[PDB]
Amino acid sequence: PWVRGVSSIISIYWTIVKPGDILLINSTGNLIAPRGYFKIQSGKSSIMRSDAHID
Amino acid sequence: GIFGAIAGFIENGWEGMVDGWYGFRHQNSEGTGQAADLKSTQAAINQITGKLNRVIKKTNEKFHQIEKEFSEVEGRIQDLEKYVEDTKIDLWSYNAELLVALENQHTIDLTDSEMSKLFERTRRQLRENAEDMGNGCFKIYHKCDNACIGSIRNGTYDHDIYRNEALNNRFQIK
C-alpha cells in the first residue's frame, strides 16, 4: 500500500536480552538495525486512551 | 421492625427532637417537656459510624491491567479478555448490591434494638410505680414533678420512696 511516496514496508520486531545473555545478529541484508537499547523494567506504569484535557 | 418498636408500637418519630435520636417526652402538674437520651443516641451512632468506617476504606492502587475496549476484531484472545472483565464486574456489582442490602437491613434493625433497649431500661427503672400504656408511653401512678422526671432520665430514680403512693393509686376500684 502506498504510504507517503513508498509502496514498501518495515516489519518491527523486539528482543529482550538478559544480564549474561548476548544479542547476536546475523544478517545478509534488509536489516533495519537497532541503535542501542531501552532499559526495560516493570512497575506502577501504564497507558490509557483518552481525549480528556489534562489539567 | 424486628424488635417491633419503630413503626411497630411507637406511632411516629419526633420531628421536633433535633438534639438526639432517642429521648423522653412528658406531662405532669408542672406542665410538659422534652429532652434527649444521649446514651442510646450515641450507641446507635457509634455502631453505624463503625460499620460506615468499615465499609468506606480504600483499596490497592491498580496499575497496568488489561485492555477493556478494542478497536479491532481479534476473536479468541479478545473474547477472553472481554469475558474476564465482564465476569469480574458482575461479581463486584453483586457484592456491592448485597453488601448494601445486608448493611441497611442491619442498620434498620439495630436502631430498632436501641429503641426497645431504652424502653426496657426505663420499664425496669420504674419497677411497680408505672404501667405500660401500649404506645411507647408509661402511666405514672404518683405525683412526679419536673425534678422527679429528671431523676428517671439520668437514672437516679429510687422507686422505693414513691412505691407506697403508687401502689395505693394502682389498686383502687371505679
Ligand SMILES: *[C@@H]1O[C@H](CO)[C@@H](O[C@@H]2O[C@H](CO)[C@@H](O[C@H]3O[C@H](CO[C@H]4O[C@H](CO)[C@@H](O)[C@H](O)[C@@H]4O)[C@@H](O)[C@H](O[C@H]4O[C@H](CO)[C@@H](O)[C@H](O)[C@@H]4O[C@H]4O[C@H](CO)[C@@H](O)[C@H](O)[C@@H]4O)[C@@H]3O)[C@H](O)[C@H]2NC(C)=O)[C@H](O)[C@H]1NC(C)=O
Ligand atoms: C501494485 O498495485 C498497486 C495498486 O494498483 C500499485 O500501487 C500504486 O502505486 C503507484 C506507484 O507506486 C502509486 O502512484 C501514485 O501515488 C500517489 C498517490 O496517487 C493518489 O493520489 C491521491 C492522494 O493524494 C489519491 O486520492 C488518488 O486516489 C491516487 O491514488 C501519486 O501522487 C503519485 O504521483 C506522483 O509520483 C509519480 C512518481 O511516482 C509522478 O510521476 C507524479 O507526477 C507525482 O509526482 C508529482 O507529485 C509529487 C508530490 O505528490 C512531487 O514530489 C513530484 O515532483 C511531482 O510533482 C503516483 O502517481 C499509486 O497511488 C498506487 N495505487 C494505490 C491504489 O495504492 C502498485 O504500484 C502496483 N505495483 C506495481 C509494480 O505496479
Ligand SMILES: *[C@@H]1O[C@H](CO)[C@@H](O[C@@H]2O[C@H](CO)[C@@H](O[C@@H]3O[C@H](CO)[C@@H](O)[C@H](O[C@H]4O[C@H](CO)[C@@H](O)[C@H](O)[C@@H]4O)[C@@H]3O)[C@H](O)[C@H]2NC(C)=O)[C@H](O)[C@H]1NC(C)=O
Ligand atoms: C552469517 O554471518 C557470517 C559471518 O562471516 C556470514 O559468513 C559469510 O558468508 C558469505 C556467504 O557464503 C561468505 O562469502 C562467500 O565467500 C566467497 C568469496 O567471497 C564465495 O564462496 C561466495 O561467493 C559466491 O557468490 C557467487 C554469486 O552468486 C555464487 O554463485 C558462488 O557460489 C560464490 O561461491 C561468497 O561471497 C563469507 O566468506 C562468509 N564470511 C566469513 C568470514 O567466512 C554469513 O553469510 C551470514 N549469513 C547470512 C548473511 O545469511
Ligand SMILES: *[C@@H]1O[C@H](CO)[C@@H](O[C@@H]2O[C@H](CO)[C@@H](O)[C@H](O)[C@H]2NC(C)=O)[C@H](O)[C@H]1NC(C)=O
Ligand atoms: C443528671 O446527671 C448529670 C451528671 O452529669 C447532671 O448534669 C448536670 O446538669 C445540670 C443541669 O441540671 C448542669 O448545670 C450541669 O452542668 C450538668 N453536669 C454535667 C457534668 O453534665 C444533672 O444535674 C443530673 N440531673 C439532675 C436533675 O440534676
